[PDB]
């Protein structure tokens, strides 16, 4: 339960497969709904049970309520702490674009990683998590663009 | 319980970091299944 970034693994497919990534903060594990589909997780000999989740937001928390509440300021570069399958964690700095929706505008990160990188955290210059990478679109020119997906701290 | 977690690092801003990616402005829609589509 040390704070930090974690891989989410399964043995249900061939060998051991990385299906996504998440963030341990304040004793809560944070990831994208489509990574776990709300299943329980193991950490060593211990179990993490889902506590909150929402398919439309594509988010889920384990062991307690969603704790991440920092926001992209709309101006500054950010860092993706990318954790790709079988590869070391690496920081990638970028200026977000924008997703424009009927319900308002969201920052967007235009970086292409494999599906199992979903749930990698996006950071501000204070190292705060401003959202998770891995729900987005493929655009005309073929690139992957991710929303900056952030939950609500209740 | 199939799925398990393994630590991969600390959450820190790195001054060394490689700078890349563009900043597209995109009209999108979000459906009830949490799927984005381009408008
Ligand atoms: C990093 C990454 C993430 C995705 C991601 N997949 C996905 C799958 C199921 C659901 C959702 C997201 C949200 N609701 C259920 C995604 O945005 N998909 C949309 C588009 F990009 F395909 C996909 C990829 C990859 F591009 F590699 F397929 C990568």
Swiss-Prot record, chain B:
It is found in: Host endoplasmic reticulum membrane. Residues 9-31 are annotated as: Disordered. It is a multi-pass membrane protein. Residues 5-39 are annotated as: Interacts with and activates NS3 protease. Residues 1-39 are cytoplasmic. The central disordered region transitions to ordered by binding to NS3. Required cofactor for the serine protease function of NS3. Forms a heterodimer with serine protease NS3. May form homooligomers. Interacts with human SPCS1. Interacts with non-structural protein 2A. This is Serine protease subunit NS2B. It comes from Zika virus. The lineage of its organism: Viruses, Riboviria, Orthornavirae, Kitrinoviricota, Flasuviricetes.
């Amino acid at each position: 339960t040390t704070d930090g970034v974690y891989r989410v693994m399964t043995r249900r497919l061939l060998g051991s497969t990385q299906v996504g990534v998440g963030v341990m903060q304040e004793g809560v594990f944070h990831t994208m709904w489509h990574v776990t589909k709300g299943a329980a997780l193991r950490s060593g000999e211990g179990r993490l049970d889902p506590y909150w989740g929402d398919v439309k937001q594509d988010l889920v928390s384990y062991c307690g309520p969603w704790k991440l509440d920092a926001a992209w300021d709309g101006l500054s570069e950010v860092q993706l702490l990318a954790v790709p399958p079988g590869e070391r964690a690496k920081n990638i700095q970028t200026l977000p674009g924008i997703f424009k929706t009927k319900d308002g505008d969201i920052g967007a990160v235009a970086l292409d990683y494999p599906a199992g990188t979903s749930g990698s955290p996006i950071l501000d210059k204070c190292g705060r998590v401003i959202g998770l990478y891995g729900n987005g679109v493929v655009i005309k020119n073929g690139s992957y663009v991710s929303a900056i997906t952030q939950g609500k701290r209740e």
